[PDB]
Write a protein that holds these residues in place. Structure first.
Motif, PDB file in Angstrom:
ATOM      1  N   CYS A   1       0.868  -1.167   0.000  1.00 38.13           N
ATOM      2  CA  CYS A   1       0.000   0.000   0.000  1.00 38.13           C
ATOM      3  C   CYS A   1       0.907   1.219   0.000  1.00 38.13           C
ATOM      4  O   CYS A   1       1.824   1.296   0.810  1.00 38.13           O
ATOM      5  CB  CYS A   1      -0.846   0.005   1.262  1.00 38.13           C
ATOM      6  SG  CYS A   1      -2.123   1.291   1.333  1.00 38.13           S
ATOM      7  N   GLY A   2       0.668   2.165  -0.902  1.00 34.10           N
ATOM      8  CA  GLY A   2       1.512   3.346  -0.951  1.00 34.10           C
ATOM      9  C   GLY A   2       1.076   4.373  -1.972  1.00 34.10           C
ATOM     10  O   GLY A   2      -0.087   4.399  -2.367  1.00 34.10           O
ATOM     11  N   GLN A   3       2.014   5.221  -2.393  1.00 33.34           N
ATOM     12  CA  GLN A   3       1.733   6.268  -3.371  1.00 33.34           C
ATOM     13  C   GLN A   3       1.641   5.672  -4.754  1.00 33.34           C
ATOM     14  O   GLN A   3       2.370   4.739  -5.075  1.00 33.34           O
ATOM     15  CB  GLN A   3       2.801   7.361  -3.327  1.00 33.34           C
ATOM     16  CG  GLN A   3       2.690   8.238  -2.090  1.00 33.34           C
ATOM     17  CD  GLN A   3       3.579   9.453  -2.170  1.00 33.34           C
ATOM     18  OE1 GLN A   3       4.798   9.337  -2.234  1.00 33.34           O
ATOM     19  NE2 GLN A   3       2.971  10.632  -2.175  1.00 33.34           N
ATOM     20  N   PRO A   4       0.752   6.222  -5.598  1.00 29.83           N
ATOM     21  CA  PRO A   4       0.499   5.779  -6.972  1.00 29.83           C
ATOM     22  C   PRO A   4       1.645   5.076  -7.662  1.00 29.83           C
ATOM     23  O   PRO A   4       2.745   5.607  -7.771  1.00 29.83           O
ATOM     24  CB  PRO A   4       0.076   7.063  -7.670  1.00 29.83           C
ATOM     25  CG  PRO A   4      -0.715   7.730  -6.605  1.00 29.83           C
ATOM     26  CD  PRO A   4       0.191   7.572  -5.393  1.00 29.83           C
ATOM     27  N   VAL A   5       1.354   3.872  -8.137  1.00 25.43           N
ATOM     28  CA  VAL A   5       2.329   3.038  -8.825  1.00 25.43           C
ATOM     29  C   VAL A   5       1.732   2.506 -10.148  1.00 25.43           C
ATOM     30  O   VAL A   5       0.516   2.448 -10.320  1.00 25.43           O
ATOM     31  CB  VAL A   5       2.778   1.861  -7.883  1.00 25.43           C
ATOM     32  CG1 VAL A   5       1.753   0.741  -7.865  1.00 25.43           C
ATOM     33  CG2 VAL A   5       4.110   1.352  -8.306  1.00 25.43           C
ATOM     34  N   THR A   6       2.583   2.150 -11.098  1.00 25.68           N
ATOM     35  CA  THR A   6       2.101   1.629 -12.378  1.00 25.68           C
ATOM     36  C   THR A   6       2.760   0.271 -12.573  1.00 25.68           C
ATOM     37  O   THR A   6       3.923   0.113 -12.239  1.00 25.68           O
ATOM     38  CB  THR A   6       2.511   2.546 -13.586  1.00 25.68           C
ATOM     39  OG1 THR A   6       2.109   3.900 -13.340  1.00 25.68           O
ATOM     40  CG2 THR A   6       1.840   2.074 -14.869  1.00 25.68           C
ATOM     41  N   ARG A   7       2.037  -0.712 -13.102  1.00 25.08           N
ATOM     42  CA  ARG A   7       2.659  -2.007 -13.314  1.00 25.08           C
ATOM     43  C   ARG A   7       3.449  -2.041 -14.622  1.00 25.08           C
ATOM     44  O   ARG A   7       2.971  -1.639 -15.687  1.00 25.08           O
ATOM     45  CB  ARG A   7       1.631  -3.152 -13.299  1.00 25.08           C
ATOM     46  CG  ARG A   7       2.289  -4.532 -13.437  1.00 25.08           C
ATOM     47  CD  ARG A   7       1.360  -5.676 -13.098  1.00 25.08           C
ATOM     48  NE  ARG A   7       1.081  -5.795 -11.667  1.00 25.08           N
ATOM     49  CZ  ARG A   7       1.969  -6.149 -10.743  1.00 25.08           C
ATOM     50  NH1 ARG A   7       3.217  -6.428 -11.072  1.00 25.08           N
ATOM     51  NH2 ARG A   7       1.597  -6.240  -9.481  1.00 25.08           N
TER      52      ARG A   7
ATOM     53  N   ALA B   1       6.092   0.717 -10.736  1.00 25.84           N
ATOM     54  CA  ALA B   1       6.934   1.904 -10.570  1.00 25.84           C
ATOM     55  C   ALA B   1       6.103   3.115 -10.207  1.00 25.84           C
ATOM     56  O   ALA B   1       4.903   3.151 -10.489  1.00 25.84           O
ATOM     57  CB  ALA B   1       7.689   2.189 -11.840  1.00 25.84           C
ATOM     58  N   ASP B   2       6.741   4.109  -9.593  1.00 27.52           N
ATOM     59  CA  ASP B   2       6.050   5.323  -9.187  1.00 27.52           C
ATOM     60  C   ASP B   2       5.292   5.962 -10.334  1.00 27.52           C
ATOM     61  O   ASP B   2       5.873   6.285 -11.364  1.00 27.52           O
ATOM     62  CB  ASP B   2       7.034   6.359  -8.637  1.00 27.52           C
ATOM     63  CG  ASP B   2       7.464   6.074  -7.209  1.00 27.52           C
ATOM     64  OD1 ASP B   2       6.859   5.209  -6.535  1.00 27.52           O
ATOM     65  OD2 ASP B   2       8.414   6.739  -6.754  1.00 27.52           O
TER      66      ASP B   2
ATOM     67  N   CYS C   1       0.718   2.352   5.143  1.00 27.65           N
ATOM     68  CA  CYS C   1       0.627   2.595   3.712  1.00 27.65           C
ATOM     69  C   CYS C   1       1.729   3.555   3.319  1.00 27.65           C
ATOM     70  O   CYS C   1       1.483   4.638   2.786  1.00 27.65           O
ATOM     71  CB  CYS C   1      -0.755   3.157   3.320  1.00 27.65           C
ATOM     72  SG  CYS C   1      -1.116   3.042   1.534  1.00 27.65           S
ATOM     73  N   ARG C   2       2.957   3.124   3.604  1.00 32.00           N
ATOM     74  CA  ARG C   2       4.172   3.883   3.306  1.00 32.00           C
ATOM     75  C   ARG C   2       5.083   3.086   2.375  1.00 32.00           C
ATOM     76  O   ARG C   2       6.253   3.432   2.242  1.00 32.00           O
ATOM     77  CB  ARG C   2       4.972   4.178   4.589  1.00 32.00           C
ATOM     78  CG  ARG C   2       4.282   5.025   5.658  1.00 32.00           C
ATOM     79  CD  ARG C   2       3.821   6.342   5.077  1.00 32.00           C
ATOM     80  NE  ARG C   2       3.495   7.343   6.084  1.00 32.00           N
ATOM     81  CZ  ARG C   2       4.391   7.953   6.846  1.00 32.00           C
ATOM     82  NH1 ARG C   2       5.679   7.658   6.734  1.00 32.00           N
ATOM     83  NH2 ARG C   2       4.001   8.892   7.690  1.00 32.00           N
ATOM     84  N   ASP C   3       4.557   2.030   1.740  1.00 31.27           N
ATOM     85  CA  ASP C   3       5.358   1.182   0.849  1.00 31.27           C
ATOM     86  C   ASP C   3       5.851   1.843  -0.437  1.00 31.27           C
ATOM     87  O   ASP C   3       5.095   2.524  -1.133  1.00 31.27           O
ATOM     88  CB  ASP C   3       4.599  -0.093   0.473  1.00 31.27           C
ATOM     89  CG  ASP C   3       4.285  -0.972   1.662  1.00 31.27           C
ATOM     90  OD1 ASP C   3       5.176  -1.242   2.501  1.00 31.27           O
ATOM     91  OD2 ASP C   3       3.121  -1.417   1.739  1.00 31.27           O
ATOM     92  N   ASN C   4       7.129   1.617  -0.736  1.00 28.49           N
ATOM     93  CA  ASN C   4       7.791   2.138  -1.935  1.00 28.49           C
ATOM     94  C   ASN C   4       7.619   1.189  -3.126  1.00 28.49           C
ATOM     95  O   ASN C   4       7.409  -0.022  -2.967  1.00 28.49           O
ATOM     96  CB  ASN C   4       9.287   2.359  -1.675  1.00 28.49           C
ATOM     97  CG  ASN C   4       9.557   3.577  -0.799  1.00 28.49           C
ATOM     98  OD1 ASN C   4      10.637   3.720  -0.214  1.00 28.49           O
ATOM     99  ND2 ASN C   4       8.578   4.466  -0.714  1.00 28.49           N
TER     100      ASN C   4
END
Ligand SMILES: *[C@@H]1O[C@H](CO)[C@@H](NC(C)=O)[C@H](O[C@H]2O[C@H](CO)[C@H](O)[C@H](O)[C@H]2O)[C@H]1NC(C)=O
Length: 158
Positions: free
Chosen positions: A121-127, A134-135, A151-154
């Motif tokens: 869980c974290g900031q917007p990522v793209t598969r 990736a961010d 929800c601090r996952d990189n």
């Protein structure tokens, strides 16, 4: 009794406020983004099953077997929740949301644990590939300060 005595009370009462709201305004937003997260989750069931049953991440809501329309998975502060290749991104509405979190989003993605998967869980990522995201760096991610400690996952959390 007198006028000035009142002004002091009013000034006192009014100063405790100005002081106390930049933290209530955050308890508040931190409460709202906390739901963008609950609406994001529960979509994990669908997404996990799809992946484990087929070995491919669901491409969209319809593949994962959820409200085909992302706008049907909306909330009060959540304007929606869309599945984009196993990654579930929740978006913050524009009406009824703090101020620096509206229109902003977070993502929930998973990873092949082999026979199972683990969620982040974290900031917007793209598969990128079936095991790499990736961010989604674009400027609409919910700021770290509004995200829970869970929800601090990189993008590369393993
Ligand atoms: C649901 O996610 C699937 C992920 O594997 C995806 N398949 C592929 C290969 O990407 C599905 O799309 C397929 O099926 C739809 C059905 O209408 C359509 O025919 C696509 O051309 C096909 O790739 C995803 N379903 C949908 C509806 O997109």
């Amino acid at each position: 009794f007198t006028l000035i005595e009142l002004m002091i009370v009013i000034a006192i009462v009014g100063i405790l406020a100005a002081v106390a709201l930049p933290a209530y305004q955050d308890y508040t937003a931190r409460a709202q983004v906390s739901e963008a997260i609950l609406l994001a989750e529960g979509q994990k069931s669908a997404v996990t099953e799809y992946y484990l049953n087929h070995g491919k991440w669901p491409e969209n809501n319809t593949s994962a077997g959820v409200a085909s329309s992302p706008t049907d998975i909306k909330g009060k502060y959540v304007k929606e929740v869309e599945v984009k290749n196993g990654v579930v991104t929740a978006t913050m509405l524009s009406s009824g949301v703090n101020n620096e979190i509206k229109g902003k989003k977070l993502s929930l993605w998973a990873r092949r644990e082999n026979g199972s998967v683990k969620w982040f869980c974290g900031q917007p990522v793209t598969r990128t590939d079936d095991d790499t995201v990736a961010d989604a760096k674009d400027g609409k991610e919910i700021d770290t300060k509004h995200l829970p400690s869970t929800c601090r996952d990189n993008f590369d959390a393993k």
